[PDB]
Amino acid sequence: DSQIQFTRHASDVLLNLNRLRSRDILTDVVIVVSREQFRAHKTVLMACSGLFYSIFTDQLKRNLSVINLDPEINPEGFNILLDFMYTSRLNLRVGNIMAVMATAMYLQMEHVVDTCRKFIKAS
Amino acid sequence: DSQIQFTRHASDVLLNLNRLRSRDILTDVVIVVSREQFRAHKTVLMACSGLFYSIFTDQLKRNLSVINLDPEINPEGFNILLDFMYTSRLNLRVGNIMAVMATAMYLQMEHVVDTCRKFIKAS
Ligand SMILES: CC(C)NC(=O)Cn1cc(CN2CCN(C)CC2)c2ccc(NC(=S)NCCc3c[nH]c4ccccc34)cc21
Ligand SMILES: CC(C)NC(=O)Cn1cc(CN2CCN(C)CC2)c2ccc(NC(=S)NCCc3c[nH]c4ccccc34)cc21
Numbered sequence: 001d002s003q004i005q006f007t008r009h010a011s012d013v014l015l016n017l018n019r020l021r022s023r024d025i026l027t028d029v030v031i032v033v034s035r036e037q038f039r040a041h042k043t044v045l046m047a048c049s050g051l052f053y054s055i056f057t058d059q060l061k062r063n064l065s066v067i068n069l070d071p072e073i074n075p076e077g078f079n080i081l082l083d084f085m086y087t088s089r090l091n092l093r094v095g096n097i098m099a100v101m102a103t104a105m106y107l108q109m110e111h112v113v114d115t116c117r118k119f120i121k122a123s
Numbered sequence: 124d125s126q127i128q129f130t131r132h133a134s135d136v137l138l139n140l141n142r143l144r145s146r147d148i149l150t151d152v153v154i155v156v157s158r159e160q161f162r163a164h165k166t167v168l169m170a171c172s173g174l175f176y177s178i179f180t181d182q183l184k185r186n187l188s189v190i191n192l193d194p195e196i197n198p199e200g201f202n203i204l205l206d207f208m209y210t211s212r213l214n215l216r217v218g219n220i221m222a223v224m225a226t227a228m229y230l231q232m233e234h235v236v237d238t239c240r241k242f243i244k245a246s
Binding site: 003004005006007009010011012013014016017020025026041042043044046047048056057062084085088089090091092111115119 | 126127128129130132133134135136137139140143148149164165166167169170171179180185207208210211212213214215234238
């Protein structure tokens with residue numbers, strides 16, 4: 001409310017969280033997408049994705065160390081979205097727009113889908 | 124670099140991380156401060172504190188579920204800093220500044236220490 005605001009703190013936290021991912025420090029889940037595998041932190045996955053929230057919030061699945069995604073998910077599209085989660089930067093190109101949008105819908109990241117919609121429209 | 128920037132994503136992630144802490148979801152450590160206990164996420168602690176980074180980055184201590192802080196640490200001051208880590212907001216009042224500053228020194232949060240110094244200077 002009337003507390004002092006650190007305007008860079010949130011971005012600095014996310015940057016260190018991504019650094020921890022890049023060194024595999026306290027990563028607690030691998031996400032299998034067809035042939036690929038991505039290690040990550042369940043907390044960040046839950047904070048950023050409705051699908052991952054709905055999985056790990058259920059005590060039936062909260063302790064899983066492996067999550068197999070839908071085999072139709074494109075790994076490049078997932079990687080772009082995983083990067084976004086940890087960076088706030090979304091790499092939308094003409095060559096990946098369709099794969100990134102579809103993957104964002106499957107992961108229930110509405111703002112990204114909403115931004116994919118505006119990207120479409122601005123093309 | 125040339126990707127789309129989501130200016131509110133990092134703050135949105137931290138808010139959900141704090142929500143997860145408030146429901147004790149995926150918390151993986153308890154910090155003992157005199158007669159008090161605080162549950163938290165090791166990744167957030169490490170991202171925010173040089174002390175907590177140095178502890179959990181060491182494989183000798185990375186798997187600890189309990190951390191006992193120095194008995195001289197004031198629990199209210201620790202709580203204020205724990206809140207700051209998860210909110211980017213620092214509750215500095217001249218009734219608590221000394222105990223917050225000394226705690227931020229122990230936790231190796233230089234940004235906060237530097238701010239406490241200017242709070243003193245701005246009187
Ligand atoms: C970084 C940020 C912008 N990314 C998201 O918000 C992605 N996301 C997208 C959704 C799904 N949306 C939600 C809004 N709704 C109208 C349409 C469907 C979603 C859901 C959960 C989380 N993760 C966490 S920790 N949420 C804590 C609050 C909460 C949400 N639903 C709850 C259910 C029970 C208790 C708490 C909650 C992230 C989610
Ligand atoms: C959210 C942000 C504003 N809060 C901090 O930065 C609090 N903090 C304060 C310090 C201690 N400072 C650091 C600067 N130095 C000149 C004086 C002492 C500190 C240390 C680690 C972390 N956590 C993480 S993940 N760091 C990843 C990068 C890294 C730092 N040291 C490394 C050593 C080896 C490998 C990597 C690194 C947080 C730290």
